[PDB]
Short mmCIF file of all heavy atoms in Angstrom, two decimals:
data_model
loop_
_atom_site.label_atom_id
_atom_site.label_comp_id
_atom_site.label_asym_id
_atom_site.label_seq_id
_atom_site.Cartn_x
_atom_site.Cartn_y
_atom_site.Cartn_z
N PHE A 294 11.99 5.73 6.53
CA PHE A 294 11.74 7.15 6.74
C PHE A 294 10.47 7.37 7.55
O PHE A 294 10.40 8.28 8.39
CB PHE A 294 11.65 7.85 5.38
CG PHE A 294 11.21 9.29 5.45
CD1 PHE A 294 12.12 10.29 5.69
CD2 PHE A 294 9.88 9.63 5.24
CE1 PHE A 294 11.72 11.62 5.75
CE2 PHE A 294 9.48 10.95 5.30
CZ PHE A 294 10.40 11.94 5.55
N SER A 295 9.44 6.55 7.31
CA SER A 295 8.17 6.69 8.00
C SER A 295 8.29 6.37 9.48
O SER A 295 7.56 6.94 10.30
CB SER A 295 7.12 5.78 7.36
OG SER A 295 6.86 6.17 6.03
N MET A 296 9.19 5.45 9.83
CA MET A 296 9.42 5.15 11.24
C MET A 296 9.85 6.38 12.02
O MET A 296 9.62 6.45 13.23
CB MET A 296 10.48 4.05 11.38
CG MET A 296 9.94 2.65 11.21
SD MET A 296 11.20 1.48 10.70
CE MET A 296 11.59 0.74 12.28
N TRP A 297 10.46 7.37 11.36
CA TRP A 297 10.87 8.62 11.99
C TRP A 297 9.87 9.75 11.78
O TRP A 297 9.64 10.54 12.70
CB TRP A 297 12.24 9.04 11.46
CG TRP A 297 12.64 10.45 11.77
CD1 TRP A 297 13.18 10.92 12.93
CD2 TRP A 297 12.55 11.57 10.89
NE1 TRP A 297 13.42 12.27 12.83
CE2 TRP A 297 13.04 12.70 11.59
CE3 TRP A 297 12.09 11.74 9.58
CZ2 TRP A 297 13.09 13.97 11.02
CZ3 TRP A 297 12.14 13.01 9.02
CH2 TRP A 297 12.64 14.10 9.73
N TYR A 298 9.26 9.83 10.60
CA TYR A 298 8.40 10.97 10.28
C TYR A 298 7.01 10.81 10.90
O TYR A 298 6.39 11.80 11.32
CB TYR A 298 8.33 11.13 8.76
CG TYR A 298 7.73 12.42 8.28
CD1 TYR A 298 8.49 13.59 8.22
CD2 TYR A 298 6.40 12.48 7.88
CE1 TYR A 298 7.95 14.77 7.78
CE2 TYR A 298 5.84 13.66 7.44
CZ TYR A 298 6.62 14.80 7.39
OH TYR A 298 6.07 15.98 6.95
N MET A 299 6.50 9.58 10.93
CA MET A 299 5.25 9.22 11.62
C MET A 299 5.48 8.71 13.04
O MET A 299 4.76 7.82 13.49
CB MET A 299 4.48 8.18 10.82
CG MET A 299 3.93 8.60 9.47
SD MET A 299 2.72 9.93 9.66
CE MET A 299 3.63 11.39 9.19
N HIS A 300 6.46 9.24 13.77
CA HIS A 300 6.74 8.69 15.09
C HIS A 300 5.68 9.06 16.12
O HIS A 300 5.44 8.29 17.06
CB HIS A 300 8.11 9.16 15.57
CG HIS A 300 8.15 10.60 15.97
ND1 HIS A 300 8.41 11.62 15.08
CD2 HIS A 300 7.93 11.19 17.16
CE1 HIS A 300 8.37 12.77 15.71
NE2 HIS A 300 8.08 12.55 16.97
N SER A 301 5.03 10.22 15.97
CA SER A 301 4.06 10.71 16.94
C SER A 301 2.62 10.46 16.50
O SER A 301 1.68 11.00 17.08
CB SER A 301 4.28 12.20 17.21
OG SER A 301 4.17 12.94 16.01
N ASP A 302 2.44 9.64 15.47
CA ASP A 302 1.11 9.32 14.97
C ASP A 302 0.49 8.23 15.84
O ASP A 302 1.09 7.15 15.99
CB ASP A 302 1.20 8.87 13.52
CG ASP A 302 -0.16 8.72 12.85
OD1 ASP A 302 -1.19 8.94 13.52
OD2 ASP A 302 -0.19 8.39 11.65
N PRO A 303 -0.69 8.45 16.42
CA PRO A 303 -1.30 7.41 17.26
C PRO A 303 -1.67 6.14 16.50
O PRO A 303 -1.90 5.11 17.14
CB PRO A 303 -2.54 8.10 17.83
CG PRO A 303 -2.80 9.27 16.93
CD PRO A 303 -1.46 9.71 16.44
N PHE A 304 -1.74 6.18 15.17
CA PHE A 304 -2.12 5.03 14.36
C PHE A 304 -1.04 4.72 13.34
O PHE A 304 -1.29 4.55 12.14
CB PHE A 304 -3.47 5.27 13.67
CG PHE A 304 -4.61 5.46 14.62
CD1 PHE A 304 -5.24 6.69 14.74
CD2 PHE A 304 -5.06 4.41 15.40
CE1 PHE A 304 -6.30 6.87 15.61
CE2 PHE A 304 -6.12 4.58 16.28
CZ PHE A 304 -6.73 5.81 16.38
N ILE A 305 0.21 4.63 13.81
CA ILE A 305 1.33 4.34 12.92
C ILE A 305 1.26 2.91 12.40
O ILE A 305 1.63 2.64 11.24
CB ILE A 305 2.66 4.61 13.66
CG1 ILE A 305 3.85 4.21 12.79
CG2 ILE A 305 2.69 3.90 15.00
CD1 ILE A 305 5.19 4.54 13.42
N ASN A 306 0.78 2.00 13.24
CA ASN A 306 0.66 0.59 12.87
C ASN A 306 -0.32 0.48 11.71
O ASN A 306 -0.10 -0.29 10.79
CB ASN A 306 0.16 -0.23 14.05
CG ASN A 306 1.23 -0.46 15.10
OD1 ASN A 306 2.23 0.24 15.14
ND2 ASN A 306 1.01 -1.44 15.96
N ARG A 307 -1.40 1.24 11.78
CA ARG A 307 -2.39 1.26 10.71
C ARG A 307 -1.76 1.84 9.45
O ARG A 307 -2.03 1.38 8.35
CB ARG A 307 -3.61 2.07 11.11
CG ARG A 307 -4.68 2.12 10.04
CD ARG A 307 -5.84 2.99 10.48
NE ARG A 307 -6.41 2.52 11.73
CZ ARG A 307 -7.34 3.18 12.41
NH1 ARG A 307 -7.80 4.34 11.97
NH2 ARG A 307 -7.81 2.68 13.55
N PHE A 308 -0.94 2.87 9.62
CA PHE A 308 -0.28 3.52 8.50
C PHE A 308 0.62 2.52 7.79
O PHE A 308 0.64 2.45 6.57
CB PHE A 308 0.54 4.70 9.01
CG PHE A 308 1.11 5.57 7.92
CD1 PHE A 308 0.32 6.48 7.26
CD2 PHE A 308 2.45 5.47 7.58
CE1 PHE A 308 0.85 7.28 6.27
CE2 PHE A 308 2.98 6.27 6.59
CZ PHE A 308 2.18 7.17 5.93
N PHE A 309 1.36 1.73 8.56
CA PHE A 309 2.23 0.71 7.99
C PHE A 309 1.45 -0.38 7.28
O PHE A 309 1.88 -0.89 6.25
CB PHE A 309 3.20 0.15 9.03
CG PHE A 309 4.47 0.94 9.14
CD1 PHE A 309 4.51 2.12 9.85
CD2 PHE A 309 5.61 0.51 8.50
CE1 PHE A 309 5.68 2.85 9.94
CE2 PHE A 309 6.78 1.23 8.59
CZ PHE A 309 6.82 2.41 9.31
N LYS A 310 0.31 -0.77 7.84
CA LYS A 310 -0.54 -1.79 7.24
C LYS A 310 -1.04 -1.29 5.89
O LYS A 310 -1.07 -2.04 4.92
CB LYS A 310 -1.74 -2.08 8.14
CG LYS A 310 -2.46 -3.37 7.81
CD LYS A 310 -3.96 -3.14 7.68
CE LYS A 310 -4.57 -2.59 8.96
NZ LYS A 310 -5.17 -3.67 9.79
N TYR A 311 -1.44 -0.03 5.84
CA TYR A 311 -1.93 0.60 4.62
C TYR A 311 -0.87 0.67 3.55
O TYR A 311 -1.14 0.43 2.38
CB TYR A 311 -2.45 1.99 4.92
CG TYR A 311 -3.86 2.02 5.46
CD1 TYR A 311 -4.39 0.91 6.10
CD2 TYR A 311 -4.64 3.15 5.35
CE1 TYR A 311 -5.67 0.93 6.60
CE2 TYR A 311 -5.92 3.18 5.84
CZ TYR A 311 -6.43 2.07 6.47
OH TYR A 311 -7.71 2.10 6.97
N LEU A 312 0.35 1.03 3.94
CA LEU A 312 1.46 1.11 2.99
C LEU A 312 1.75 -0.26 2.41
O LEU A 312 2.01 -0.39 1.22
CB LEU A 312 2.71 1.67 3.66
CG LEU A 312 2.68 3.13 4.11
CD1 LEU A 312 3.98 3.49 4.82
CD2 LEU A 312 2.46 4.07 2.93
N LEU A 313 1.71 -1.28 3.26
CA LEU A 313 1.95 -2.64 2.82
C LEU A 313 0.86 -3.08 1.86
O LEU A 313 1.14 -3.75 0.87
CB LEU A 313 2.00 -3.58 4.03
CG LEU A 313 2.57 -4.97 3.77
CD1 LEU A 313 4.00 -4.86 3.25
CD2 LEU A 313 2.53 -5.79 5.04
N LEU A 314 -0.38 -2.70 2.14
CA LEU A 314 -1.50 -3.06 1.28
C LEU A 314 -1.33 -2.46 -0.10
O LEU A 314 -1.59 -3.11 -1.11
CB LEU A 314 -2.82 -2.61 1.90
CG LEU A 314 -3.36 -3.49 3.03
CD1 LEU A 314 -4.47 -2.77 3.78
CD2 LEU A 314 -3.85 -4.81 2.48
N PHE A 315 -0.89 -1.21 -0.15
CA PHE A 315 -0.64 -0.56 -1.43
C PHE A 315 0.47 -1.27 -2.20
O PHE A 315 0.37 -1.45 -3.42
CB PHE A 315 -0.27 0.91 -1.23
CG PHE A 315 0.49 1.50 -2.38
CD1 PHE A 315 -0.16 1.86 -3.55
CD2 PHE A 315 1.86 1.68 -2.31
CE1 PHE A 315 0.53 2.40 -4.61
CE2 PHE A 315 2.56 2.21 -3.37
CZ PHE A 315 1.90 2.57 -4.53
N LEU A 316 1.53 -1.67 -1.50
CA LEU A 316 2.62 -2.38 -2.17
C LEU A 316 2.14 -3.71 -2.75
O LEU A 316 2.51 -4.09 -3.87
CB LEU A 316 3.78 -2.61 -1.20
CG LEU A 316 4.97 -3.41 -1.72
CD1 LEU A 316 5.67 -2.66 -2.84
CD2 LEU A 316 5.93 -3.71 -0.59
N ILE A 317 1.30 -4.43 -2.00
CA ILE A 317 0.77 -5.70 -2.49
C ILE A 317 -0.09 -5.48 -3.73
O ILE A 317 0.02 -6.21 -4.73
CB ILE A 317 -0.03 -6.41 -1.39
CG1 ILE A 317 0.90 -6.83 -0.24
CG2 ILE A 317 -0.76 -7.63 -1.94
CD1 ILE A 317 0.17 -7.28 1.00
N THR A 318 -0.95 -4.46 -3.70
CA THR A 318 -1.78 -4.16 -4.87
C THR A 318 -0.93 -3.76 -6.06
O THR A 318 -1.27 -4.10 -7.21
CB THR A 318 -2.79 -3.06 -4.54
OG1 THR A 318 -2.11 -1.96 -3.94
CG2 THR A 318 -3.85 -3.58 -3.59
N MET A 319 0.17 -3.05 -5.83
CA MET A 319 1.05 -2.68 -6.94
C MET A 319 1.75 -3.89 -7.54
O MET A 319 1.89 -3.98 -8.76
CB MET A 319 2.08 -1.65 -6.47
CG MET A 319 2.94 -1.14 -7.60
SD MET A 319 1.90 -0.29 -8.79
CE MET A 319 1.53 1.17 -7.85
N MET A 320 2.20 -4.83 -6.70
CA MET A 320 2.77 -6.06 -7.24
C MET A 320 1.73 -6.85 -8.03
O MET A 320 2.04 -7.43 -9.07
CB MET A 320 3.37 -6.91 -6.13
CG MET A 320 4.35 -6.17 -5.22
SD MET A 320 5.85 -5.66 -6.08
CE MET A 320 5.53 -3.92 -6.36
N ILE A 321 0.49 -6.86 -7.55
CA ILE A 321 -0.59 -7.52 -8.29
C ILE A 321 -0.78 -6.87 -9.65
O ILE A 321 -0.92 -7.55 -10.67
CB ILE A 321 -1.89 -7.51 -7.47
CG1 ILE A 321 -1.78 -8.44 -6.26
CG2 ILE A 321 -3.07 -7.90 -8.34
CD1 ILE A 321 -2.96 -8.37 -5.34
N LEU A 322 -0.78 -5.53 -9.68
CA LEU A 322 -0.93 -4.82 -10.95
C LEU A 322 0.21 -5.12 -11.90
O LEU A 322 -0.01 -5.36 -13.09
CB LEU A 322 -1.02 -3.31 -10.68
CG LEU A 322 -1.30 -2.32 -11.81
CD1 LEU A 322 -2.02 -1.11 -11.27
CD2 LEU A 322 -0.02 -1.89 -12.51
N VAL A 323 1.45 -5.10 -11.40
CA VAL A 323 2.61 -5.23 -12.26
C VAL A 323 2.75 -6.65 -12.80
O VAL A 323 3.02 -6.85 -13.99
CB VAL A 323 3.87 -4.77 -11.51
CG1 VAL A 323 5.13 -5.29 -12.19
CG2 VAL A 323 3.90 -3.25 -11.41
N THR A 324 2.56 -7.65 -11.95
CA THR A 324 2.81 -9.03 -12.33
C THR A 324 1.62 -9.69 -13.03
O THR A 324 1.71 -10.87 -13.37
CB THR A 324 3.20 -9.87 -11.11
OG1 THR A 324 2.13 -9.84 -10.15
CG2 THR A 324 4.45 -9.31 -10.47
N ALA A 325 0.54 -8.95 -13.25
CA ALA A 325 -0.67 -9.54 -13.82
C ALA A 325 -0.43 -9.97 -15.27
O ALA A 325 0.24 -9.28 -16.03
CB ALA A 325 -1.83 -8.56 -13.75
N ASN A 326 -1.01 -11.11 -15.64
CA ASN A 326 -0.93 -11.63 -17.00
C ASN A 326 -2.23 -11.47 -17.77
O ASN A 326 -2.20 -11.48 -19.01
CB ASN A 326 -0.54 -13.11 -16.98
CG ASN A 326 -0.19 -13.64 -18.36
OD1 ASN A 326 0.34 -12.91 -19.20
ND2 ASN A 326 -0.50 -14.91 -18.61
N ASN A 327 -3.36 -11.33 -17.09
CA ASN A 327 -4.66 -11.14 -17.73
C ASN A 327 -5.23 -9.78 -17.34
O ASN A 327 -4.81 -9.15 -16.38
CB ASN A 327 -5.62 -12.27 -17.35
CG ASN A 327 -6.01 -12.24 -15.89
OD1 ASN A 327 -7.01 -11.64 -15.51
ND2 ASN A 327 -5.21 -12.90 -15.06
N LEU A 328 -6.21 -9.34 -18.13
CA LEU A 328 -6.79 -8.01 -17.92
C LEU A 328 -7.59 -7.92 -16.62
O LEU A 328 -7.66 -6.85 -16.03
CB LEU A 328 -7.67 -7.62 -19.11
CG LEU A 328 -6.93 -6.99 -20.29
CD1 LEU A 328 -7.91 -6.47 -21.32
CD2 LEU A 328 -6.01 -5.88 -19.81
N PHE A 329 -8.20 -9.02 -16.18
CA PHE A 329 -8.98 -8.97 -14.95
C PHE A 329 -8.08 -8.80 -13.73
O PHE A 329 -8.38 -7.99 -12.84
CB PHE A 329 -9.85 -10.22 -14.81
CG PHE A 329 -10.95 -10.08 -13.80
CD1 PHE A 329 -12.11 -9.41 -14.12
CD2 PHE A 329 -10.81 -10.61 -12.53
CE1 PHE A 329 -13.13 -9.28 -13.19
CE2 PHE A 329 -11.82 -10.48 -11.59
CZ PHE A 329 -12.98 -9.81 -11.93
N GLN A 330 -6.98 -9.55 -13.67
CA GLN A 330 -6.03 -9.40 -12.57
C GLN A 330 -5.42 -8.00 -12.57
O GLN A 330 -5.24 -7.38 -11.50
CB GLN A 330 -4.94 -10.46 -12.68
CG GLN A 330 -4.30 -10.86 -11.37
CD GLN A 330 -3.41 -12.07 -11.52
OE1 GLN A 330 -3.74 -13.01 -12.25
NE2 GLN A 330 -2.28 -12.06 -10.83
N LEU A 331 -5.08 -7.49 -13.75
CA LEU A 331 -4.51 -6.15 -13.83
C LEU A 331 -5.54 -5.10 -13.44
O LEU A 331 -5.18 -4.07 -12.86
CB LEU A 331 -3.97 -5.91 -15.24
CG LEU A 331 -3.10 -4.68 -15.54
CD1 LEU A 331 -2.20 -4.98 -16.72
CD2 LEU A 331 -3.92 -3.43 -15.81
N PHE A 332 -6.82 -5.36 -13.70
CA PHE A 332 -7.88 -4.48 -13.22
C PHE A 332 -8.01 -4.54 -11.71
O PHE A 332 -8.27 -3.51 -11.06
CB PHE A 332 -9.21 -4.87 -13.88
CG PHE A 332 -10.30 -3.86 -13.67
CD1 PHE A 332 -10.04 -2.50 -13.80
CD2 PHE A 332 -11.58 -4.27 -13.34
CE1 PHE A 332 -11.05 -1.58 -13.62
CE2 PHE A 332 -12.58 -3.34 -13.15
CZ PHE A 332 -12.32 -2.00 -13.29
N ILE A 333 -7.84 -5.73 -11.13
CA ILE A 333 -7.87 -5.85 -9.67
C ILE A 333 -6.77 -5.00 -9.05
O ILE A 333 -7.01 -4.25 -8.10
CB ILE A 333 -7.73 -7.33 -9.25
CG1 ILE A 333 -8.95 -8.13 -9.72
CG2 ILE A 333 -7.56 -7.45 -7.75
CD1 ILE A 333 -8.78 -9.63 -9.56
N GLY A 334 -5.56 -5.09 -9.60
CA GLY A 334 -4.48 -4.24 -9.11
C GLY A 334 -4.73 -2.77 -9.36
O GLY A 334 -4.44 -1.92 -8.51
N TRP A 335 -5.28 -2.45 -10.54
CA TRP A 335 -5.59 -1.08 -10.92
C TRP A 335 -6.53 -0.43 -9.92
O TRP A 335 -6.35 0.74 -9.54
CB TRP A 335 -6.22 -1.09 -12.31
CG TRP A 335 -6.18 0.20 -13.07
CD1 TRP A 335 -7.16 1.14 -13.13
CD2 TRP A 335 -5.15 0.64 -13.95
NE1 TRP A 335 -6.79 2.17 -13.96
CE2 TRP A 335 -5.55 1.88 -14.48
CE3 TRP A 335 -3.91 0.12 -14.33
CZ2 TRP A 335 -4.76 2.61 -15.37
CZ3 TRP A 335 -3.12 0.84 -15.21
CH2 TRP A 335 -3.55 2.07 -15.72
N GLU A 336 -7.55 -1.17 -9.49
CA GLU A 336 -8.50 -0.63 -8.53
C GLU A 336 -7.97 -0.67 -7.10
O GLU A 336 -8.30 0.21 -6.30
CB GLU A 336 -9.82 -1.40 -8.63
CG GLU A 336 -10.53 -1.10 -9.92
CD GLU A 336 -11.18 0.25 -9.90
OE1 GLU A 336 -12.28 0.39 -9.32
OE2 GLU A 336 -10.59 1.18 -10.48
#
């Protein structure tokens, strides 16, 4: 959807990088087994 809605954004590549970063942090939060790792994802 973002490939169409952010089509005229001069920094779409940055937007995609940011979205990917959020997804990685969410996987870190969800798959964490200890409180420190889950805090890393939380932040």
Side-chain angles (χ1 to χ4, degrees):
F294 172 85
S295 296
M296 278 156 99
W297 166 83
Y298 192 82
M299 294 298 102
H300 72 272
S301 58
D302 189 358
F304 298 112
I305 176 176
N306 286 18
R307 180 183 303 172
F308 188 78
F309 272 80
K310 196 230 300 263
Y311 278 24
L312 292 176
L313 195 59
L314 282 166
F315 158 77
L316 177 65
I317 294 168
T318 50
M319 185 63 72
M320 308 294 102
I321 290 174
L322 185 151
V323 162
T324 60
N326 191 33
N327 67 93
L328 275 188
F329 196 80
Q330 207 170 321
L331 191 154
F332 192 43
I333 295 170
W335 200 265
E336 291 285 280

